[PDB]
Write a protein that holds these residues in place. Structure first.
Motif, short mmCIF file in Angstrom:
data_model
loop_
_atom_site.label_atom_id
_atom_site.label_comp_id
_atom_site.label_asym_id
_atom_site.label_seq_id
_atom_site.Cartn_x
_atom_site.Cartn_y
_atom_site.Cartn_z
N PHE A 1 10.11 -6.46 8.60
CA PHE A 1 8.89 -7.17 8.33
C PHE A 1 8.12 -6.46 7.01
O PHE A 1 7.71 -6.50 6.62
CB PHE A 1 8.48 -7.05 9.14
N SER A 2 8.79 -4.72 7.03
CA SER A 2 8.10 -4.31 6.03
C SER A 2 8.48 -5.03 4.75
O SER A 2 7.50 -4.30 3.58
CB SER A 2 8.65 -2.56 6.70
N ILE A 3 10.13 -5.41 4.77
CA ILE A 3 10.57 -5.62 3.15
C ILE A 3 9.52 -6.99 3.00
O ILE A 3 8.56 -7.02 1.57
CB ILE A 3 11.69 -6.46 2.90
N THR B 1 5.90 -8.78 18.11
CA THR B 1 4.53 -7.99 17.43
C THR B 1 4.45 -6.69 16.62
O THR B 1 4.38 -6.32 15.89
CB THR B 1 4.02 -7.97 18.53
N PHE B 2 5.60 -5.55 17.67
CA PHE B 2 5.71 -4.34 16.84
C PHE B 2 6.44 -3.97 15.44
O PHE B 2 5.28 -3.61 14.55
CB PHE B 2 6.17 -3.65 17.85
N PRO B 3 7.49 -5.47 14.78
CA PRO B 3 7.37 -4.97 13.84
C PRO B 3 6.31 -5.36 12.70
O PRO B 3 6.14 -4.19 11.60
CB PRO B 3 8.83 -5.51 13.45
N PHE B 4 5.50 -6.29 12.97
CA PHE B 4 5.10 -6.60 12.40
C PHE B 4 3.60 -5.59 11.91
O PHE B 4 3.20 -5.33 10.77
CB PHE B 4 4.30 -8.14 12.97
N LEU B 5 3.05 -5.02 13.35
CA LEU B 5 2.04 -4.09 13.11
C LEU B 5 2.34 -2.91 12.28
O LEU B 5 1.68 -2.62 11.29
CB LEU B 5 1.62 -4.10 14.32
N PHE B 6 3.75 -2.63 12.60
CA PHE B 6 4.63 -1.46 11.97
C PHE B 6 4.73 -1.67 10.43
O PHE B 6 5.07 -0.74 9.27
CB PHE B 6 6.14 -0.78 12.13
N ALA B 7 4.32 -2.92 9.99
CA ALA B 7 4.98 -3.17 8.40
C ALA B 7 3.93 -3.50 7.62
O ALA B 7 3.51 -2.36 7.05
CB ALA B 7 5.65 -4.78 8.65
N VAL B 8 2.82 -4.08 8.11
CA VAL B 8 1.25 -4.01 7.92
C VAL B 8 1.21 -2.43 7.56
O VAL B 8 0.00 -2.04 7.12
CB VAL B 8 0.16 -4.76 8.39
N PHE C 1 7.37 -2.59 -0.46
CA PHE C 1 8.60 -3.62 -0.67
C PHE C 1 9.83 -1.69 -0.78
O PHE C 1 10.24 -2.87 0.43
CB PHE C 1 8.11 -3.83 -1.31
N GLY C 2 9.66 -1.50 -1.49
CA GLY C 2 10.32 -0.43 -1.78
C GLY C 2 10.97 0.83 -1.09
O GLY C 2 12.56 1.03 -0.28
N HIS C 3 10.21 1.11 -0.40
CA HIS C 3 9.97 2.40 1.26
C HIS C 3 10.81 1.39 2.17
O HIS C 3 12.12 1.78 2.98
CB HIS C 3 9.06 2.39 1.68
N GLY C 4 10.61 0.02 2.39
CA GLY C 4 10.78 -0.90 3.51
C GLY C 4 12.94 -1.27 3.01
O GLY C 4 13.57 -0.96 4.25
N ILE C 5 13.01 -1.42 1.67
CA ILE C 5 14.54 -1.53 0.93
C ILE C 5 14.76 -0.44 2.23
O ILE C 5 16.33 -0.10 2.27
CB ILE C 5 14.62 -1.96 0.27
N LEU C 6 14.34 0.94 1.28
CA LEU C 6 15.25 2.21 2.09
C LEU C 6 15.49 2.58 3.03
O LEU C 6 16.48 3.12 3.14
CB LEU C 6 14.42 3.51 1.28
N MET C 7 14.25 2.31 4.20
CA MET C 7 14.51 2.61 5.43
C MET C 7 15.53 1.58 5.71
O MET C 7 16.16 1.63 7.07
CB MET C 7 13.52 2.60 5.85
N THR C 8 15.50 0.48 5.50
CA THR C 8 16.04 -0.61 6.19
C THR C 8 17.74 -0.45 5.58
O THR C 8 18.59 -0.34 6.23
CB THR C 8 16.69 -1.96 5.95
N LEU C 9 18.40 0.53 4.11
CA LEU C 9 19.30 0.37 4.14
C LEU C 9 19.63 1.99 5.35
O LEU C 9 20.63 1.82 5.29
CB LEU C 9 19.66 1.50 2.68
N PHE C 10 18.83 2.68 5.17
CA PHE C 10 18.91 3.98 6.51
C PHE C 10 19.22 3.45 8.20
O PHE C 10 20.19 3.72 8.37
CB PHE C 10 17.45 4.73 6.69
N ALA C 11 18.75 2.04 8.05
CA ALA C 11 19.15 1.34 9.51
C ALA C 11 19.92 0.66 9.62
O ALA C 11 21.11 0.76 10.19
CB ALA C 11 18.38 0.02 10.32
N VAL C 12 20.60 0.10 8.34
CA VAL C 12 21.91 -0.69 7.97
C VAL C 12 23.13 0.68 8.09
O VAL C 12 24.39 0.20 8.83
CB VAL C 12 21.89 -1.02 7.02
N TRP C 13 23.36 1.75 7.30
CA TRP C 13 23.72 2.76 8.02
C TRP C 13 24.29 3.53 9.65
O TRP C 13 25.10 3.80 9.47
CB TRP C 13 23.83 4.25 6.82
#
Lengths: 356, 350, 150, 203, 43, 39, 150, 150, 103, 150, 150, 103, 52
Positions: free
Chosen positions: A68-70, A10-17, A22-34
């Motif tokens: 979910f942001s992506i 639930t919480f990822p979906f609500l934070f995603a909406v 798309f781009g910001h989601g990519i950037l912070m997935t890159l952060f999390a993956v790092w």
């Protein structure tokens, strides 16, 4: 029942909406993956910055956030205030717009804009995903987009709190409270549904039952809902969705009213009846159930209204990104060949810094 | 200005009437002479019974001593003061709160020194001068810890504002208790003067001169007694309240004074204190300087009763009636020791 | 062509000039006199070396009146609504400038007198303040006379 | 203490707006748009009569009430130990109701002359009534505030008198003389009112 | 035509809203957090 | 002009009414509670 | 013939009538309640007596209500501008008189209640000043009743 | 034929009727509730005894609702400028009556709660004094209802 | 955690304001008949002032009951009751606003 | 002929003649009476000496009243509107100058109360200071007489 | 040719002159006289030595009166409408300049009274400062003597 | 480090002040029907006074909460939680402002 | 002696207004364009308030 496993999704979906890009989601997935690739090194390393520790401990939370942001950046068709073009914008044929009694329209167009009309008999067709990019460049996008975003947020809130009200029944089942079922979950869930489920099906009914052939003097969702709530039924002034709806609305309101007495006083009355049969302050328990009814009803109404924070933050992000595009990366584009690029270098440096 | 003489009555008419009545109930010089015409403590009780005083030793021990009459006078003062205070409103209630702080300071001085030297709190409770209250918890049962009572003073006791200048328990242990109370007394006078000046009406006119004289008096006697004791001159000057005619000039000559005649020279520049010093001949068997000061304060109190629209009347009767109690006590002492040759050593209350 | 409210405005200019100048001078004398009355007791000998700020509030009054009477003597009925503007501006300017100057004179004179009750050396710096008080008064005078000649 | 700040702000804004509007009108030489005759000819004399009566009774009522509570607080304070005060100080509350009657009777004097006009066009119609009802207004506010302050002074003087009477009742009349003076001032007010209502006629 | 009535109404509504917002601003400005508990420790 | 004559007296009456009302409100705002009781 | 806007004066009069008298009655209840609350702890035997000014404050409210309802009955649309003016004057006058009587009743009530708390002898005098205040309120009623028909 | 902007005054009446009584209730409950939080903390045996001022503030709020809704549901475009003024007067009347009643009940309730902390005998008389202010509000409602249907 | 209810109530009063605000906003046009627009103004004033009253009550009572419940736990329920009363005030305002939004 | 409404200036002449003067008179009497009540407490023999400020506040009342009676005698319908300007100016002058003399005699009077209370000698001096204030009141009178008959 | 209301300005001129000067003299007897009543308690010997500021306030009154009557005898119906402005400005000027010397004298004399009490040497300077205040009074009279005859 | 928490969030009020201000600095023109002009006035004053509301609440509450965090570390969670509603309020302001700026 | 710096500086603050005022007087005329008078008012009040 532990709510954590359900929150995990639930919480990822609500934070995603709430972060629908798309781009910001990519950037912070890159952060999390790092974070995740540097797990072992960071684990064997002191980090007095407690903010870093707290974000790191929930790093997989951040991964879910970003996935979910992506996904929502894709469905909303936004990426740094720009829509994605699969070239499926097959709705408005422009040469056929010229064919549709628009002859030498450009002569007037040199000073005006000439909004496209509805149902010219020659338009029609959806977009493969999300919103058509034609709205990404339109001026009526504000009126078009924000409305169904509002209604969408209402829908999502209703389904989430439905799920919560079912969890309450599961608690009741586990702990063997038949009073919390007969006078508890069942009456209150039918109370909620008899209003909000009707609202949902009315919304979808209008969305799939009225088109631009009936735009002139079309119905209105809020007006009809107010007519329901106030028991006002004017003969004209509002196109009627379907025949006999007045009686149905009256019945739904009546059952919603009939749901109050259960949680209000039927359970404590049964408590007193059983106690007297066996032979415990009636007044205090009555007050407890009274505050229970009040908190449930007012909480339901307040939550149903407050889920529009969804809409609010979605609009806030969208407009912030659009302004950031219109002020920063917009001014870096110029006819000049070399000086344009040289300025664009530092302009996009500032763009990136402010964006992150 | 127009602000006074209109709002005062609306919320203090009854209290003004009551205090004026109690003022009219004072004992004249004739009453004092009648009491002096007793030659015994029983006749003193009878003379008290001829007025609103007396009738309190009934249902008590037949023998009479000084302590009994002193306790009765103090109890009457406390009962009437509390009764009046309870029926009050905030502009007057702050005033009475200042009047109570003037003894809160003495009580907090008493309470400390019973913890540096381990002593129970409850045994000090009766020793505290009445009107002390201290009905606030966590000042009681401090486990005899200076930090505990210090925190209780900062938190519960309303004197925290004054204790913003006496802090950290370093002054509590190292530096003499008397100088602690003197500094807190100075700060309290400063705050009281500022609050009075905020109420710029008949109340300001009544209480600015009295407090001015009080501070100037205190600085004078501070310099008088400091000669024979170990005390830095700066540590003497820091105990002079700034709310006096001395502060613009005169406090400095007192700060560098060394003998009684130099203090006399400082007082000479001000005729109001020149007359009091000259009347203070310091002769062996006559009145002394502080008696002249008490006379000054009493006549200023009597002067304060000429106006109706000031809160000063309450302070005035408090001072005048405790002075009456002191006079009664002194006459009792003269009677008890059979030193009737010194019966004329009390300031009248007009 | 020539209005009467032009003469009205010129007269109010001269009025407001002397008005505000008198306000400043009276306030300055009041505060200065209170300061002297405070200092005089411990320093009875400097009663003759204390009138200075009072004289200088007097100088502010000189400015106020010279402008006021100068504008008054230039009054007429045939005014083209322009010299009336100049007169009104001049008068109000010099007036409130004198008001501010006298206010400054009063406060600084009282404070300096109270400081001099034990510090005779403060006299010099007190004069140093007084000169800039007169500078403000002079600046009230200057543009007002300029406008009276424009 | 913010209420007086609010009142000061209101007054300052009102006065500044009036000054600015006046200087602007004088600047632009507007053609008597600040027409006094327009402000005045459109004024019904019924205002004048009715507000004269209303002020005449209202201000007297307010002052008499003020004296009433001032004397009440003072007598109640002084009677705690000297209840003989009430033998004498009630004359002050009698004077307060006198403050009331001075205004009430003159309200009747004005109200006797309540009449209609049946006139619409202001110019040169009802020339006498215009001054008459106005004068009723002037006399009414005059007698009203007259009785008002008379009651105020009588009351606070009676407060002083009562607090003096607490300790000695013999000097009460010696204090009551000044109340007589205040009554005389109120009478001056009533006389000016009758001189302002003796040459008037309505409709 | 009848611009005077419109002017009166707009003036009245504007000053009323101004009065309400200003009095509320003055109210919220002078809040008292208590000046007690740990605030004692911080004086 | 600047005003409609049909409502000037009404404006004045409203001014007097609000004047007396703000007098009353200033008076009622001076009210306040009672502190600790006597015995 | 009938002037326009003729109806708003008298309704606002009846308003003011019930408004300001209600303020006075509120004043009486406000102050007398603080009285009785302060009092009955020491002497709970005189609670019934302390309701004397409270009923009277209610009666002030009755004065205002009587005038307000009368004016409410007597209003109409076809006013010659005269009756509405009479209604305005009567209503505002009774309202302000109720206000005055109510405040006097309230603070005299609390004071004399204290006077009864200590000295019982002041109780009849308390009723005395209260009856005079009620006579004032009744003047306020009666003159307005005269005005609504004048 | 009807005057322009006629119906607006009745709607402002409804708004005033509503908001003034809302202020009254919001204050009547607040100070009483602080009294409850300060009194019941050490005598919690009277929690149920001292909810009466809160219910009374609720009654005032209900009076505000009923008058405001009644006026709002009687609205139309074709008013002769004479119904709207009456509705305005009624609305202001009841609204400020509820306001003053709210203040009175709040202060009296706090005073009586503390008093019955000290002395249980007050309780009934305290309720009676509360009835007085509620009935003042009721008088205001009487006049407002007479005007609304006029 | 138990002390957060009045903050939620303040949020609910924000809901009460915002719902009517957006209802008035989306019910707008340029060529209005000047009747409904005036009604929207009146509704806005009513709901705003009611929400302000609710804000005052909820802030004051929340503080008082929060400082109370710590000492005497029996005050917590009464605190909650008065919070309900503040919400009811907000709802009264909301009722009149919704009536005026479609009259 | 006479412009309509011309008498309004003269009638406010009468009002403003007496109103502020009587303010001052009853202020002076009021406050001197309280000071002399304190005197009555502390010694009774100077009661004949205490009547001085009061009769002179009466003199202020006369200063107002004589002018007011003159205007109220000169009142009529067809006034030239050029005498009425003088009537109005005279009225406001004498009124507020009576107010001036009024609070002046009051404050000086209660200063003299205590001054003579402790020292009988200052009685003569404080009478002199008092006489100055009624000279100011007569000043307030005489220009009013000049203008009202000019 | 000269329009109506032309004579109006001059009478307020004369009035405002005497009005403001009366205020000044009232404040002069206000502060200094009470200062005498407070000071001379302990120094009755200087009862004859400090009447100077009070008579000086009297002189301010004289200035006001002289200009007021000067305008009173020089006004007319057929006035040019410029002389009216001159008289208005002159009267305002001299009146408030009298007020100016008024509060200057009040404060200075109140300070000088007890300043002479403590140190009798202050008498050398006190009357000099009062002379400065009366110089400001003369300044006002100068402007009045220029404007009125202009 | 904890001192910076409320202040970064205080910056969002200024962000919101820019949000509509820049938007309308860009979208303004001369040939305006005079009604959208009114809408923009309403939006601007709405978001602005919402900025005042958020500023007031954030200042006082961040102040008090950071005192109570300087004493008790547990208070931090409630500090953040209560801080939420101030930006919710500012958000409500921006909601109405955008609706009026686009309606 | 050294403490006199802020007072000379206060005089300089008045210089800022006085000199500009003399410039306005120099540029002031009866027949002004209704647009240079404007700039004179703007400049004058601006420098005045800044000096305050």
């Amino acid at each position: 029942i532990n709510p954590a496993p359900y929150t995990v999704i639930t919480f990822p979906f609500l934070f995603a909406v709430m972060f629908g890009d798309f781009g910001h989601g990519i950037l912070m997935t890159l952060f999390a993956v790092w974070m995740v690739l540097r797990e072992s090194r960071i684990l064997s390393q002191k980090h007095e910055n407690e903010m870093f520790s707290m974000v790191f401990s929930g790093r997989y939370i951040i991964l879910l956030m970003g996935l979910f942001s992506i996904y929502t950046g894709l469905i909303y068709n936004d990426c740094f205030s720009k829509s994605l073009n699969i070239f499926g914008s097959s709705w408005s044929v422009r040469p056929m717009f010229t064919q549709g009694n628009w002859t030498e329209e450009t002569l007037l167009g040199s000073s005006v804009l000439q909004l496209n009309p509805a149902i010219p008999g020659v338009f029609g067709g959806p977009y493969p995903f999300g919103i058509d990019p034609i709205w990404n460049i339109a001026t009526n996008k504000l009126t078009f987009l924000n409305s169904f975003k509002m209604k969408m947020s209402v829908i999502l809130g209703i389904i989430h709190m439905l799920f919560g009200v079912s969890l309450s029944l599961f608690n009741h089942i586990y702990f063997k409270k038949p009073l919390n079922i007969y006078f508890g979950f069942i009456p209150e869930i039918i109370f909620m549904s008899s209003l909000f489920g009707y609202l949902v099906i009315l919304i979808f009914y209008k969305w799939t039952a009225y088109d631009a052939h009936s735009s002139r003097n079309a119905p209105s969702l809020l007006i009809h809902f107010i007519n329901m709530f106030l028991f006002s039924y004017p003969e004209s002034g509002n196109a009627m969705l379907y025949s006999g709806q007045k009686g149905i609305q009256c019945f739904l309101i009546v059952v919603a009213m009939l749901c109050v007495p259960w949680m209000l006083l039927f359970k404590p009355l049964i408590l007193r009846h059983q106690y007297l049969r066996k032979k415990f302050d009636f007044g205090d328990t009555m007050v407890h159930q009274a505050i229970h009814t009040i908190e449930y009803c007012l909480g339901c109404i307040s939550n149903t209204a407050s889920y529009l924070r969804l809409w609010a933050l979605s609009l806030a992000h969208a407009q912030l990104s659009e302004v950031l595009w219109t002020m920063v990366i917009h001014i870096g584009l110029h006819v000049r060949s070399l000086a344009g690029g040289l300025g664009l270098f530092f302009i996009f440096a500032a763009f990136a810094t402010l964006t992150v | 200005s127009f602000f006074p003489e209109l709002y005062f009555n609306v919320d203090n008419g009854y209290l003004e009437g009551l205090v004026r009545g109690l003022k009219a109930g004072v004992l004249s010089q004739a009453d004092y002479l009648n009491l002096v015409q007793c030659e015994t403590l029983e006749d003193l009780k009878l003379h008290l019974q001829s007025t609103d005083y007396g009738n309190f030793l009934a249902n008590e021990a037949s023998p009479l001593t000084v302590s009994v009459i002193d306790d009765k006078l103090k109890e009457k003062m406390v009962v009437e003061f509390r009764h009046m205070r309870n029926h009050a409103y905030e502009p007057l209630a702050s005033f009475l709160d200042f009047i109570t702080y003037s003894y809160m300071i003495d009580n907090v001085i008493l309470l400390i020194t019973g913890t540096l030297h381990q002593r129970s709190i409850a045994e000090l409770v009766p020793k505290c001068h009445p009107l002390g209250s201290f009905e606030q918890m966590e000042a009681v049962n401090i486990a005899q810890t200076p930090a505990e009572l210090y925190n209780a003073i900062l938190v519960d006791t309303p004197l925290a504002a004054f204790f913003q200048d006496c802090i950290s328990e370093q002054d509590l242990d190292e530096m003499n208790i008397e100088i602690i109370r003197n500094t807190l007394y100075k700060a309290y006078l400063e705050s009281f003067y500022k609050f009075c000046t905020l109420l710029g009406g008949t109340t300001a006119d009544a209480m600015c001169p009295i407090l001015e004289f009080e501070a100037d008096r205190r600085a004078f006697i501070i310099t008088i007694n400091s000669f024979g004791t170990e005390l830095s001159k700066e540590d003497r000057a820091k105990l002079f309240p700034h709310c006096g005619r001395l502060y613009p000039e005169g406090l400095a000559q007192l700060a560098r004074a060394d003998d009684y005649e130099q203090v006399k020279n400082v007082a000479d520049y001000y005729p109001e204190y020149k007359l009091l010093f000259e009347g203070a001949g310091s002769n062996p068997g006559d009145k002394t300087l502080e008696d002249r000061f008490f006379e000054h304060e009493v006549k200023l109190n009597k002067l304060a009763f000429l106006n109706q629209f000031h809160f000063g009347v309450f302070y005035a009767f408090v001072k005048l009636k405790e002075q009456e109690c002191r006079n009664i006590v002194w006459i009792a002492e003269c009677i008890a020791q059979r030193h009737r040759a010194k019966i004329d050593n009390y300031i009248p209350i007009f | 062509n020539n209005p009467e409210y032009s003469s009205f405005f010129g007269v109010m200019g001269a009025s407001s000039a002397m008005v505000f100048s008198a306000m400043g001078a009276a306030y300055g004398t009041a505060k200065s006199g209170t300061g002297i009355a405070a200092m005089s007791v411990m320093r009875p000998e400097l009663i003759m070396k204390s009138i200075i700020p009072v004289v200088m509030a007097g100088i502010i009054a000189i400015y106020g009146l010279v402008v006021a009477v100068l504008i008054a003597n230039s009054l007429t009925d045939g005014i083209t609504l322009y010299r009336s503007f100049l007169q009104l501006g001049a008068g109000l300017s010099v007036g409130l400038s004198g008001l501010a100057a006298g206010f400054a004179i009063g406060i600084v004179g009282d404070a300096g007198v109270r400081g001099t009750a034990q510090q005779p050396r403060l006299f010099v710096g007190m004069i140093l303040i007084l000169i800039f008080a007169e500078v403000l008064g002079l600046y009230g005078l200057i543009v007002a006379l300029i406008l009276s000649t424009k | 203490t913010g209420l007086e700040l609010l009142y000061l702000g209101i007054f300052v804004a009102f006065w500044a707006c009036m000054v600015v509007v006046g200087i602007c009108y004088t600047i632009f030489d507007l053609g008597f748009r600040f027409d006094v005759a327009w402000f005045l000819t459109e004024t019904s004399p019924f205002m004048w009569s009715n507000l004269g009566i209303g002020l005449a009774i209202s201000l007297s009522v307010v002052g008499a009430a003020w004296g009433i509570y001032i004397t009440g607080s003072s007598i109640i304070g002084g009677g705690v130990k000297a209840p003989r005060i009430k033998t004498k100080n009630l004359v002050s509350i009698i004077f307060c109701e006198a403050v009331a009657i001075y205004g009430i009777i003159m309200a009747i004097v004005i109200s006797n002359m309540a009449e209609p006009f049946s006139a619409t066009e202001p110019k040169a119609i009802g020339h006498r009534n215009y001054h008459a009802g106005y004068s009723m207004f002037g006399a009414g506010l005059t007698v009203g505030l007259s009785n008002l302050f008379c009651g105020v002074c009588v009351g606070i003087v009676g407060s002083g008198a009562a607090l003096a009477d607490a300790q000695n009742p013999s000097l009460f009349v010696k204090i009551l003389i000044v109340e007589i003076f205040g009554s005389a001032i109120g009478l001056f007010g009533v006389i000016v009112a009758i001189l302002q209502t003796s040459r008037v006629k309505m409709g | 035509l009848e611009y005077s009535v419109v002017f009166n109404l707009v003036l009245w509504i504007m000053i009323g809203l101004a009065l309400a917002v200003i009095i509320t601003s003055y109210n919220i400005w002078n809040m008292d957090p208590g000046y007690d508990s740990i605030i004692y420790r911080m004086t | 002009g600047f005003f409609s004559p049909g409502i000037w007296m009404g404006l004045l009456t409203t001014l007097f009414m609000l004047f007396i009302f703000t007098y009353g409100l200033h008076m009622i705002l001076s009210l306040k509670t009672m502190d600790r009781f006597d015995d």
